[PDB]
């Protein structure tokens, strides 16, 4: 996202150099690059002292929002903003039923 | 009245709980007291059979990482699921 724009010039340089019959090849703004806000993946307790028939519903919300990308409530994401992957960390604390 | 004053056979939940107690005492004694198991019956029913249904999934519980008689019968029903 940052450390992919060197990479991205030089395989650039390399196919507007071989190219004979034309000049200008063009580009996408950095925004597209820069940005983690155009991709899917960008207070709080402990969420283990709560009564347990309320856990279930408020870790199955927090997960659904986390499979998408989004960061939970519960769940934290943990940093990143290059390449591939990403890490989420739910609590430590929560019910070992519920935690498995 | 006053009542003909139920037996041992008869009543079963509280005087259940006290020959159950009274009888792991006595063993207790028998070897010295390195034995030690409290409780005639805890946590619940409910409780521990759900514990040996996530044993059967294959992965961690409450009472296991994957009368004082019940660890006889939990052994059956725990290694079913390991």
Same mark, same amino acid.
């Given at each position: ?12 340089? =390399? ?11 063009? #580009?996408?703004?950095?925004? /597209?690059?820069?940005?983690? @806000?155009?991709? !899917? ?5 402990? #969420? !283990? ?18 499979? /998408?990308?989004? =960061? !939970? ?7 990143? @903003? !290059? ?11 929560? =019910?070992?039923? #519920?935690?498995? | ?18 020959? $159950? ?19 005639? %019956?805890?946590?619940? &029913? $409910? &409780? ?6 996530? %044993? ?20 059956? %029903? ?5």
């Amino acid at each position: 996202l940052q450390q992919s724009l060197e990479l991205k010039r030089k395989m650039l340089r =390399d196919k507007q150099n071989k190219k004979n019959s034309g000049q200008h090849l063009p #580009i996408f703004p950095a925004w /597209v690059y820069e940005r983690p @806000a155009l991709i !899917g993946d960008f207070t709080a307790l402990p #969420i !283990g002292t709560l009564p347990l028939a309320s856990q279930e519903s408020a870790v199955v919300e927090d997960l659904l929002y986390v499979l /998408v990308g989004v =960061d !939970g409530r519960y769940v934290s994401a943990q940093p990143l @903003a !290059g390449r591939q992957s990403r890490t989420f960390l739910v609590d430590p604390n929560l =019910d070992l039923s #519920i935690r498995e | 009245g006053h009542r003909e004053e139920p037996y041992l056979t008869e009543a079963g939940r509280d005087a259940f709980d006290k020959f $159950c107690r009274l009888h792991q005492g006595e063993l207790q004694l028998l070897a010295g007291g390195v034995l030690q198991a409290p409780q005639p %019956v805890l946590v619940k &029913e $409910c &409780e521990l059979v759900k514990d040996v249904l996530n %044993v059967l999934i294959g992965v961690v519980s409450a009472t296991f990482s994957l009368p004082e008689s019940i660890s006889s019968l939990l052994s059956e %029903v725990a290694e079913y699921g390991t």
